[PDB]
């Protein structure tokens, strides 16, 4: 119905609520193999609900974090950003 919405990989500044970061932003390690990283697909991410399938976009490169705005916890600026740490295996 609703997966972790990937607001990353579209660097486009405009008149909207982006900022330099979210409120309670958190880095969560995202394991992705080299094939699924380049072509895109799905991977197993760690969540409090258990292992979820995150639909990975194409072009995905090691060391880049998928900043998923609003997927972090609420705070001063509104909600935090969930950075999925692309680990190409």
UniProtKB/Swiss-Prot annotation:
Subcellular localization(s) per the UniProt record: Cytoplasm
Transmembrane segments: none
Functional summary from the UniProt entry: Does not influence ATP binding or hydrolysis nor ADP release. Exerts influence on the interaction of DnaK with substrates; in the presence of DafA, DnaJ inhibits substrate binding, and substrate already bound to DnaK is displaced by DnaJ and DafA.
Subunit structure and binding partners: Forms a heterononamer with DnaJ and DafA in the resting state. Three copies of each protein are present in the complex.
Family under the similarity heading: Belongs to the DnaJ family.
Full protein name: Chaperone protein DnaJ 2
Source species of the chain: Thermus thermophilus (strain ATCC 27634 / DSM 579 / HB8)
Lineage of origin: Bacteria, Thermotogati, Deinococcota, Deinococci, Thermales
Portion of the parent chain present: 192 to 256 of 280
């Amino acid at each position: 119905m609703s997966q972790l919405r990937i607001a990353a990989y579209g660097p486009h500044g405009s008149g909207g609520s982006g900022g330099s970061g979210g409120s309670q932003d958190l880095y969560a390690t995202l394991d992705v193999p080299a094939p699924i990283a380049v072509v895109g697909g799905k991977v197993r991410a760690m969540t409090l609900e258990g292992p979820v399938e995150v639909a990975v976009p194409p072009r995905t490169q090691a060391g880049r974090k998928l900043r998923l705005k609003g997927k972090g916890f609420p705070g001063p600026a509104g909600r935090g950003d969930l950075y999925l740490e692309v680990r190409i295996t």
